Symmetry: C2
Subunit: 114 residues, 2 copies
């Protein structure tokens, strides 16, 4: 394997996906088995370079704050699926590094896991 902490498992289009929680990512990313892809693409700038990638079609995403529709960047070069600021803002998540490792906590104060 899973990504390191902080990580979260979410149902995305009916399948569980374990994400690295990534405050440095502007948009969320799927890396393998993305399902149907749109013919729309975007320029993705990473830490080490940049490349063009496709968006997925819409997926239902089961957030603790309630389900929403979301489309992901399919980036098969990326080592882990990433949950970026686009969905973190919807979750109003809190990420805690005090204690061992790191835990994701919802807006209700309930710990999310994964």
């Amino acid at each position: 394997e899973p990504p390191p902490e902080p990580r979260i498992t979410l149902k995305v289009g009916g399948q569980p996906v374990t994400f690295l929680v990534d405050t440095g990512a502007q948009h969320s990313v799927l890396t393998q088995n993305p399902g149907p892809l749109s013919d729309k693409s975007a320029w993705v700038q990473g830490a080490t370079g940049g490349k063009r990638y496709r968006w997925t079609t819409d997926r239902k995403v089961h957030l603790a704050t309630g389900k929403v529709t979301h489309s992901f960047l399919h980036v098969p070069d990326c080592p882990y699926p990433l949950l970026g600021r686009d969905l973190l803002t919807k979750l109003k998540a809190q990420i805690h590094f005090e204690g061992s490792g790191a835990q994701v906590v919802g807006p209700m104060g309930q710990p999310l896991q994964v």
Copy 2:
């Protein structure tokens, strides 16, 4: 032009650096005029590919409680300095997403 939120400004080597706080970064990153570099390098795997980057020599970094000595990756291909999980652990930081903003606080709600 600062990095997007969540962001924090820390003194490194005696001067402030505004970091993008990045829970997706395994180690912390400087991007420009980083000072003395180690002879050592790391393989850095980013979202789009990987290659090697040099470690800096040790730096004095001013955290909330205490100074620490820390070394950074120098990644000039990266658009912003990144405060990764290495220093987030040392700061015992919390990141809060609220409205459309994001804020970084200390182990007990003290802002940074």
